[PDB]
C-alpha cells in the first residue's frame, strides 16, 4: 500500500471504530518521511488519541479497584497484576507516539502550526506517562512534559491568534498539566482564565473553518474553571 491508500484505509478504520487499525495506518504514513498534511496530521492525532484513551480508561478503572480491595488480599493482588499489564500496554503506546515525534513530526515542522501541534502532542503524551509513573522516573518525564508544553505555549503566543483552536487546545491541556501533575491549581486556573479571556476579547478573528472548534475549547476551558473553583 502507498500513501493515498493508507489515508483512505485510515479513514475507514475510523468509521469502523477500529483504532489500532487506524493507528498503524498513520504510523506507516508518518514513517515514509514526508511532512504530514493538516488532514493527515489529524487522522494520526485521532488514531492515537483513541488508542491511548482506551487504555488510560481501563487503567483508571482497574487502578481504582486496587484501592477498593484494600483488605481483600487475594483480590488486590489480581488487580495489581492486571494494572501493571495495562500500564505496560499504555507505555508502549506512548513510546511509539513520542518516538514518532522525535524522528519525524517535530524536526519536519516547516511551519509554526505544525511545531506547536506536534510539541503539544509531546507534552500530552509524556503527561500520559506521568499519570502512570513510577517513582524516580516521574520527575524526569514530568519535566520533559513541561518543556514541550513550554516551547509550544511560547511559539503559540508569538505566532497564533488567541482564538486559534490549537492555541486554545494547548492551553486547556497545559492547564490540566499544572493542575493534575504539578499539582498547582492556582496556576492552572490563571493559565486557563487567560486563554479564555483573551479569546473572548477577540471574537472577530474566527476564520470560518474553525469557529466551532475554538468555541468548543473555550467552553471546555471555562468548565475547568467552574470545577476547579467549586
Amino acid at each position: 500500500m502507498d500513501k493515498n491508500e493508507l489515508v483512505q484505509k485510515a479513514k475507514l478504520a475510523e468509521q469502523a471504530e477500529r483504532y489500532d487499525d487506524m493507528a498503524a495506518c498513520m504510523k506507516s504514513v508518518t514513517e515514509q518521511g514526508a511532512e504530514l498534511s493538516n488532514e493527515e496530521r489529524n487522522l494520526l492525532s485521532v488514531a492515537y488519541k483513541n488508542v491511548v484513551g482506551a487504555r488510560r480508561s481501563s487503567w483508571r478503572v482497574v487502578s481504582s479497584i486496587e484501592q477498593k480491595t484494600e483488605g481483600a488480599e487475594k483480590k488486590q493482588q489480581m488487580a495489581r497484576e492486571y494494572r501493571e499489564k495495562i500500564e505496560t500496554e499504555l507505555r508502549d503506546i506512548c513510546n511509539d507516539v513520542l518516538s514518532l515525534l522525535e524522528k519525524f513530526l517535530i524536526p519536519n515542522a516547516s511551519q509554526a502550526e505544525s511545531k506547536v501541534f506536534y510539541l503539544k502532542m509531546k507534552g500530552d503524551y509524556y503527561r500520559y506517562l506521568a499519570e502512570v509513573a513510577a517513582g524516580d522516573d516521574k520527575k524526569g518525564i514530568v519535566d520533559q512534559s513541561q518543556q514541550a508544553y513550554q516551547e509550544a505555549f511560547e511559539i503559540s503566543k508569538k505566532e497564533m491568534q488567541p482564538t486559534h483552536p490549537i492555541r486554545l487546545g494547548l492551553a486547556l491541556n497545559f492547564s490540566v498539566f499544572y493542575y493534575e501533575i504539578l499539582n498547582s491549581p492556582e496556576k492552572a486556573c490563571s493559565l486557563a482564565k487567560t486563554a479564555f479571556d483573551e479569546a473572548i476579547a477577540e471574537l472577530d478573528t474566527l476564520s470560518e473553518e474553525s469557529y466551532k472548534d475554538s468555541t468548543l475549547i473555550m467552553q471546555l476551558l471555562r468548565d475547568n474553571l467552574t470545577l476547579w473553583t467549586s
Partner: peptide, 8 residues
C-alpha cells in the same frame, strides 16, 4: 471530571 483534548 476535567476536560482535555484527549477527552471523551
Amino acid at each position: 471530571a476535567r476536560k482535555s483534548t484527549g477527552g471523551k
